[PDB]
Amino acid sequence: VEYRNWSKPQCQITGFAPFSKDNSIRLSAGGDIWVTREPYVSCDPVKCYQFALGQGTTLDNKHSNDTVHDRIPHRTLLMNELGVPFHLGTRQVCIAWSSSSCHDGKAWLHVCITGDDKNATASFIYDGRLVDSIGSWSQNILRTQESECVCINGTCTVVMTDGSASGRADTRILFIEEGKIVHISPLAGSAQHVEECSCYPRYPGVRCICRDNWKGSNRPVVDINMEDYSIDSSYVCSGLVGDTPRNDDRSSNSNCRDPNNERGTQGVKGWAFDNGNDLWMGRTISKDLRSGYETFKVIGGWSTPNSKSQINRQVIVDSDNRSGYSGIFSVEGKSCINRCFYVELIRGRKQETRVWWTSNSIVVFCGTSGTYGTGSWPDGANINFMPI
Amino acid sequence: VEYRNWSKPQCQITGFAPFSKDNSIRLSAGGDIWVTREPYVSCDPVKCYQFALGQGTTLDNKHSNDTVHDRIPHRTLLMNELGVPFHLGTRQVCIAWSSSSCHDGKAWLHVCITGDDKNATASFIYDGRLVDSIGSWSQNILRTQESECVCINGTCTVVMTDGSASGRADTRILFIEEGKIVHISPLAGSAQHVEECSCYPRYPGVRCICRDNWKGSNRPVVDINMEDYSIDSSYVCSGLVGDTPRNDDRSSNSNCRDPNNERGTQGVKGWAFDNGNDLWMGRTISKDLRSGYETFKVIGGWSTPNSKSQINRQVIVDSDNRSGYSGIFSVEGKSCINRCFYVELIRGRKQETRVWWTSNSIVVFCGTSGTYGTGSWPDGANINFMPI
Amino acid sequence: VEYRNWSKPQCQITGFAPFSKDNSIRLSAGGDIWVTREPYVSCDPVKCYQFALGQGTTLDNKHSNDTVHDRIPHRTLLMNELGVPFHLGTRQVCIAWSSSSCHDGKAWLHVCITGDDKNATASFIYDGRLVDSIGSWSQNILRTQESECVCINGTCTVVMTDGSASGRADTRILFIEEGKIVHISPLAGSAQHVEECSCYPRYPGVRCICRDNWKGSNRPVVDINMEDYSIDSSYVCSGLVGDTPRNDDRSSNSNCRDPNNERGTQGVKGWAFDNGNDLWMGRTISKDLRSGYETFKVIGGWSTPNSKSQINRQVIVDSDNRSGYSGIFSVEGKSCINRCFYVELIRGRKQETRVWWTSNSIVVFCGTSGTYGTGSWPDGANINFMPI
Amino acid sequence: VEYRNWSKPQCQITGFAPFSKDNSIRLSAGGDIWVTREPYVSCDPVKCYQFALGQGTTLDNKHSNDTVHDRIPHRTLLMNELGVPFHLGTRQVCIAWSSSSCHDGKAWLHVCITGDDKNATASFIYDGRLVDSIGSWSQNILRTQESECVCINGTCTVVMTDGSASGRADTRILFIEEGKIVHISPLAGSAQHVEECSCYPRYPGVRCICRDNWKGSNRPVVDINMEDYSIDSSYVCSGLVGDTPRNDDRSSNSNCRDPNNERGTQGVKGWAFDNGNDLWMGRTISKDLRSGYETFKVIGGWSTPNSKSQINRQVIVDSDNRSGYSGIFSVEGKSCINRCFYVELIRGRKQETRVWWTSNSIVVFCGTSGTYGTGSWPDGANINFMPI
């Protein structure tokens, strides 16, 4: 086994075709399925696996009630081949309430986070053994990606926040070579917040499309130079914008460098990925609520401010339904590195308060240089059927 | 790993001996089993696996109700070793409501179909990565085999329809070398319809025994020349005939070249496989309803029109019971390539409307050059026991 | 991989120490466990697996009722590593209502039997493919071992009956080299019946301790000469005797050559295995009912008629409980070939008619050249707890 | 595969970071989970597995009632990768009511104990085959570690008691090279009792931190010389002390050589592990009841009597909750051998007599040379939710 160095062109995609759905909630009505959220999928040179954080229980468990809350001791990081539901036979690869995973080529690094909010811990596991540990630095919740990290040559990047969701924060980018952090590099850029970065291998570095829970609703970019550790974090030129809540589609703006301050409040985990001066991206159809999922390409959107030349749309999930988080997902072709992407479809309380638990399914789409039809793939489960 | 080139004689079989049953419905009363239909089994140089399309749920799920319908977003392609039931621990290898799978020798290609009926998409997955995509072409349901495709030397064939079930249609035969379609070839032949082809490796090409939902009740043949892409599609000389509904057994006819127009309406997925001028084939015992399964050899039936010299019958499934689809299943011997075949036994609504869900079990029989006894293997599950 | 030729001394054992129990019935009250009976365990050069025939269902299935009957279409041959219960995730390796399995070294041969009683079929599977088939020969139930077959050099033996349980019968010994029967050899010996042979590798041939459902209650021996195909079947010299029902322990007799005619009626699957002029054997404590299990060594018992010098007893299962079938189980040491043995503990109807289903657990003991304590390991499950 | 010889420095740890929790009880409310207790985890050069002894059943089984009792025929030794719950798909690797497991490098040795209390047996399994057996020697319960044994060069140590819990006893240290005991060595030392030793590879020998159910509440040390078989068993210099029940924290004492006689009665399985003249150890927060878990380092505590210079505490499990047993768990780093440790959290009768069954979850922590936060990880399951 030599290393995963990614030297190879990205694919000139033409849109996305469907790859995987698991029906996690549906089956949850007839089987014992874990309680999840904040999923993501990543793969080694052979199989694509699917992760997510549980709630130390199952859905048809009287326990599950109040799964709305993101952190609790009993939450663990699951793993399965891409395609199997999360069952009583799944493994809790580590304790955590946040994470990131990359396959450096040789084996896995699994950053998993847990502790008190104000003082928590981050175990850096690798190849099964626990290679390192680094604790919270601001004293107000150490959180990470909830997406696949990226490694190149033998060094795995991973961005980390601990600060004030809607406020300033310390963003560091740890460079851990084999479960062992070997160098940390402090954030720099126009980016007024970095959180839930969706990172990918666009050689020689790593580029990140994050979230901004404070003033921006136009994703902040985070570019890592795996070559010298230096950082750079701009903002997206695309005038379209994909974050929720967000202004609209006409008064929606972005100048590639400053929080736009338009419902710049919260956010959601999102992705995007360049191609020349263009921009393949995705977001919720609803711009108030996290419902419906569409994906598209903005001409000029990566190199040019306030763009609006949308083209090649797709209604991945219908706007009458509901989605949630999503992240990019790379996966090296036999000549080019193709990007893929996932979408958790969250069914549960706060919204569908018919039941008291919260969990989620997933749908995933990859890159294609061929045709496709049209459609939308939701969780599609009868909340009047589901237990509780 | 060199390639699967099939250069090796087919076996001079003498009838079929039992191989596998899974009891899918029976266990479904005491366990959490997926909701299926349109199964098939295929194997790599080591294990035989069993496929089928689910209904994004399980049987003891209040959801399952109305599984009669063939397409919906939440239907996925399962896979398991030959012998295990479809459980909560099975994987959804792709989203689809149609498919085909072959092992080119090195790894798997998994055509899976999904989208709106009128406009749908076909993901061409291979080795886990998504190599290509080609969308619907007539705008009225892109459908494929629901049986194992066949590869030789490194090129995998797969026939595709999109048109009018009971009407004309476009039938194309895609030649995808490694998840990448590299050449499409348009249908040609006496065949007035091609749909649900049951294809196999009868070197140097590939030969297909399809269905005809319009005017024929005598299977149309579809011969592929993997050598130059050319096509040829005749009809079966056998005067016996195996399709349901169908005329009878005396006024049942076929001339090897034109729809016979005798209850030539619908059909069901069927198989057949030559041997000299003869014909080993199978069909439902009931010629109105898809009930009971028998298999036999018609002397003269492959090279001679309107044949009736039946011999070596078997009551695979009793005519008091019920079957459904079926397809051929090859599996290379240590000197000859033996054919095997499967039979879904569909238990569910429209018929057994005691319950509201529809799923199916399976029985499978291989080729033998030795003796056998007699019997019939049905789903045999108490519909008064089953849930719902 | 060279072949399993067994050239290596058997171990001078000193008694049996406990190896495996699975608690099949107990868990059956809190989980979905298959309905079984007629088990046995066998191993390849790495793992020991556990077999048995199911009843196409699970225990907490309303179907299971009337599992007392041995044959029905929906019965299949399971397989799992030695230690896991038979779950909804177990595989039906073949259809059958009888069987035998050996690992010739390279891979598995799985004789499985099914068909009408009067006319049935026997599929000879191997390495996943179906290599051969041979049908019933007397027209009254083709049955086999229900124990591990034995292979040496590359030829696998397997004894087969079809005749009259309590009457004469045809006993043949098929020699199948790679799923392909290559020579059948007709039974010869003092043995007035051969049925449920418990066979083992006592180089250069294979020796069998069977059952006799007609006139004997003293196990008939069946010695195979894998060298020239010739057969020889004596009877056990041991005057102790181990079969149920059986006379007693004082008027119990055997002369090494003729059915003794003492409650010589039915039987049960049993084992035994020589050592010099002695005899390590096992049987039920109850000599009317199949309850309790003990094992011991009779000095002189293999080379001398009507023996009674019992020594080294063990109460494997207490006589207040209940057992059933049992068979020998070899397993090559790092210098000597050690024998092991299993014991199904049948819980169910006809006896414990509190419930209407019948299934069974298992306990297994191997050979030891070291000390041991005392005890008894029953199914030990509350029939008042169990479902139905 | 060469052998596991451990020549390599232990790691200068700085405290413990979280690795694994499984939520065994929580899921037990929504799934079929085995009934356990007396767990432990151990690993081969690749995966870390988790063991424990069951109670031949599952929790939602009416059987489980009265799982308070430690021994019964139907108790078996489970095994799974580190992270999966104990499910109906787990294997019973042997019958036992006590055990120990080490990976000599090449494969596993699994001492499992069962029999009458007064006369029991100990099967010494290895690589799947049963290599040896040695029976009880005092006639009053042969018990072993309930923790991972340690092998070096090719010889696996394992300490064994059989005597009087609160009285004298015979303590032997068997040296079994490949499932075959090749030399037994009798205990020697100041140690007035050895029971439930928590052993580890501190090259060239093996050192053990046991329990004392008679007069001590200050762990007895047990040092093995794998070099010449000689033994040595002192007591811990640490004046802090970690055993429950125990005096307090001020009148708590130890002189490194004699039972201190302060609530020196019972105990619990514990661990500890040196580092220079210091001592990293752990115990229950409650000194009467086995509740809460903390871990720390006592300066001077390994080489100096009655120590009280505690530092680097952690509240692993909060004192408002409840723990149970615990043991050390080694795991070779890429330059140093890191120690890890587990903690069963027992939920069940005698205490939480709301229900009638007893089982347990687990939390596990490894060694780190990096920072960490703070927190506590309990079973945290609603006893008012749980079944029974």
Ligand SMILES: *[C@@H]1O[C@H](CO[C@H]2O[C@H](CO)[C@@H](O)[C@H](O)[C@@H]2O)[C@@H](O[C@@H]2O[C@H](CO)[C@@H](O[C@@H]3O[C@H](CO)[C@@H](O)[C@H](O[C@H]4O[C@H](CO)[C@@H](O)[C@H](O)[C@@H]4O[C@H]4O[C@H](CO)[C@@H](O)[C@H](O)[C@@H]4O)[C@@H]3O)[C@H](O)[C@H]2NC(C)=O)[C@H](O)[C@H]1NC(C)=O
């Ligand atoms: C490939 O396949 C697409 C699939 O797109 C999606 O369709 C759903 C909505 O139809 C969406 O939720 C789902 O998840 C799919 O992802 C092909 O067509 C698609 O469907 C139609 C047009 O073809 C577009 O959707 C619209 O949605 C409305 C809700 O269904 C529908 O009622 C709209 O209908 C109005 O125009 C149609 C035109 O055919 C016609 O039916 C009527 O005239 C109708 O008029 C309305 O007017 C009044 C006010 O609204 C009402 O009082 C009156 O009752 C009536 O509702 C409309 O059809 C969807 O966007 C479209 N997709 C795309 C990409 O165009 C598409 O043909 C093909 N394209 C490509 C590149 O392959």
Ligand SMILES: *[C@@H]1O[C@H](CO[C@H]2O[C@H](CO)[C@@H](O)[C@H](O)[C@@H]2O)[C@@H](O[C@@H]2O[C@H](CO)[C@@H](O[C@@H]3O[C@H](CO)[C@@H](O)[C@H](O[C@H]4O[C@H](CO)[C@@H](O)[C@H](O)[C@@H]4O[C@H]4O[C@H](CO)[C@@H](O)[C@H](O)[C@@H]4O)[C@@H]3O)[C@H](O)[C@H]2NC(C)=O)[C@H](O)[C@H]1NC(C)=O
């Ligand atoms: C190997 O094993 C076969 C197994 O074949 C199948 O048998 C079932 C039907 O019997 C079928 O559903 C099942 O699934 C099996 O696959 C051996 O025999 C088989 O069974 C019989 C003859 O041997 C054939 O089946 C017929 O089915 C009727 C329903 O059971 C049965 O009642 C018929 O019986 C009439 O003739 C028999 C001859 O033995 C005799 O019983 C009576 O005289 C009976 O007369 C009827 O007459 C009146 C009008 O019908 C009634 O008023 C009166 O009450 C009575 O019903 C018949 O036996 C089945 O086809 C046959 N299989 C084959 C291949 O022949 C077979 O012996 C052997 N062959 C080979 C090559 O190995």
Ligand SMILES: *[C@@H]1O[C@H](CO[C@H]2O[C@H](CO)[C@@H](O)[C@H](O)[C@@H]2O)[C@@H](O[C@@H]2O[C@H](CO)[C@@H](O[C@@H]3O[C@H](CO)[C@@H](O)[C@H](O[C@H]4O[C@H](CO)[C@@H](O)[C@H](O)[C@@H]4O[C@H]4O[C@H](CO)[C@@H](O)[C@H](O)[C@@H]4O)[C@@H]3O)[C@H](O)[C@H]2NC(C)=O)[C@H](O)[C@H]1NC(C)=O
């Ligand atoms: C290793 O370990 C053995 C284990 O053997 C088995 O014991 C159970 C029966 O006790 C059996 O079902 C279980 O499954 C075990 O496999 C050691 O001992 C074993 O137990 C005893 C003797 O040691 C033997 O079993 C007998 O079973 C009767 C039912 O329990 C029991 O009541 C008998 O007791 C009579 O004698 C004992 C002697 O100690 C004493 O208790 C009394 O005096 C009692 O007297 C009876 O007399 C009247 C009529 O019966 C009654 O009115 C009165 O109430 C009372 O019942 C007896 O103890 C069992 O066979 C034995 N096993 C072996 C191999 O000896 C054994 O010590 C040791 N051996 C070796 C080689 O390692």
Ligand SMILES: *[C@@H]1O[C@H](CO[C@H]2O[C@H](CO)[C@@H](O)[C@H](O)[C@@H]2O)[C@@H](O[C@@H]2O[C@H](CO)[C@@H](O[C@@H]3O[C@H](CO)[C@@H](O)[C@H](O[C@H]4O[C@H](CO)[C@@H](O)[C@H](O)[C@@H]4O[C@H]4O[C@H](CO)[C@@H](O)[C@H](O)[C@@H]4O)[C@@H]3O)[C@H](O)[C@H]2NC(C)=O)[C@H](O)[C@H]1NC(C)=O
């Ligand atoms: C990293 O993270 C630690 C986590 O430690 C643990 O905290 C829980 C207890 O708080 C424990 O069960 C849990 O499992 C954790 O493992 C950081 O702090 C930790 O929490 C606090 C202090 O920081 C310590 O715990 C104490 O526990 C009491 C129960 O919660 C709590 O009420 C105590 O509060 C008293 O002092 C605090 C100081 O901040 C303040 O809140 C009040 O003044 C309060 O006063 C009480 O006084 C009267 C009598 O008690 C009452 O009438 C009145 O109502 C009120 O209760 C206290 O805070 C815990 O030990 C501590 N851990 C450590 C290691 O210090 C820690 O800051 C950081 N350290 C490091 C190295 O990283």
Ligand SMILES: *[C@@H]1O[C@H](CO)[C@@H](O[C@@H]2O[C@H](CO)[C@@H](O)[C@H](O)[C@H]2NC(C)=O)[C@H](O)[C@H]1NC(C)=O
């Ligand atoms: C990184 O990319 C590839 C794959 O890791 C490296 O491997 C060699 O690269 C090219 C073609 O890929 C040739 O020089 C060798 O034949 C490759 N070997 C294999 C097994 O692919 C490549 O050298 C690395 N290069 C950079 C610039 O990072």
Ligand SMILES: *[C@@H]1O[C@H](CO)[C@@H](O[C@@H]2O[C@H](CO)[C@@H](O)[C@H](O)[C@H]2NC(C)=O)[C@H](O)[C@H]1NC(C)=O
């Ligand atoms: C990672 O991969 C290759 C590893 O070799 C790095 O490029 C190499 O450049 C040196 C001189 O710097 C050559 O001698 C190497 O052998 C080059 N690669 C090849 C295939 O020749 C590359 O620049 C590194 N990139 C990153 C992002 O870390």
Ligand SMILES: *[C@@H]1O[C@H](CO)[C@@H](O[C@@H]2O[C@H](CO)[C@@H](O)[C@H](O)[C@H]2NC(C)=O)[C@H](O)[C@H]1NC(C)=O
């Ligand atoms: C295709 O069939 C076989 C198997 O793929 C090819 O392999 C060689 O073929 C024959 C015997 O099978 C000999 O020439 C070689 O010894 C074979 N090698 C092996 C490993 O079997 C064969 O050459 C191919 N031929 C055609 C005509 O397609």
Ligand SMILES: *[C@@H]1O[C@H](CO)[C@@H](O[C@@H]2O[C@H](CO)[C@@H](O)[C@H](O)[C@H]2NC(C)=O)[C@H](O)[C@H]1NC(C)=O
């Ligand atoms: C059968 O037994 C063994 C094992 O199959 C054969 O293997 C050779 O036998 C001996 C020692 O076992 C030596 O001649 C070789 O070194 C063995 N090789 C191995 C890999 O064990 C043996 O020759 C066979 N002999 C008979 C008489 O059947």
Ligand SMILES: *[C@@H]1O[C@H](CO)[C@@H](O[C@@H]2O[C@H](CO)[C@@H](O)[C@H](O)[C@H]2NC(C)=O)[C@H](O)[C@H]1NC(C)=O
């Ligand atoms: C099975 O195994 C060995 C295979 O070699 C057989 O014994 C051999 O005897 C021949 C001459 O007959 C020698 O040249 C072989 O090489 C011998 N074995 C060895 C290791 O030398 C053996 O007799 C056969 N036994 C059975 C029961 O089939």
Ligand SMILES: *[C@@H]1O[C@H](CO)[C@@H](O[C@@H]2O[C@H](CO)[C@@H](O)[C@H](O)[C@H]2NC(C)=O)[C@H](O)[C@H]1NC(C)=O
């Ligand atoms: C035990 O430790 C190591 C690992 O088992 C042995 O292996 C050799 O040891 C050193 C470095 O580890 C060198 O002499 C060799 O290069 C090692 N080989 C490998 C594959 O690591 C070591 O010799 C053994 N030594 C002792 C003292 O027990």
Ligand SMILES: *[C@@H]1O[C@H](CO)[C@@H](O[C@@H]2O[C@H](CO)[C@@H](O)[C@H](O)[C@H]2NC(C)=O)[C@H](O)[C@H]1NC(C)=O
């Ligand atoms: C276990 O491991 C090594 C095995 O070699 C033992 O040390 C060896 O010492 C001899 C002379 O005694 C050398 O020739 C060996 O080759 C040494 N090891 C190495 C790598 O050179 C060691 O002392 C043994 N220790 C224990 C606890 O059993």
Ligand SMILES: [Ca+2]
């Ligand atoms: Ca925002």
Ligand SMILES: [Ca+2]
């Ligand atoms: Ca038709």
Ligand SMILES: [Ca+2]
């Ligand atoms: Ca008899």
Ligand SMILES: [Ca+2]
């Ligand atoms: Ca004590």
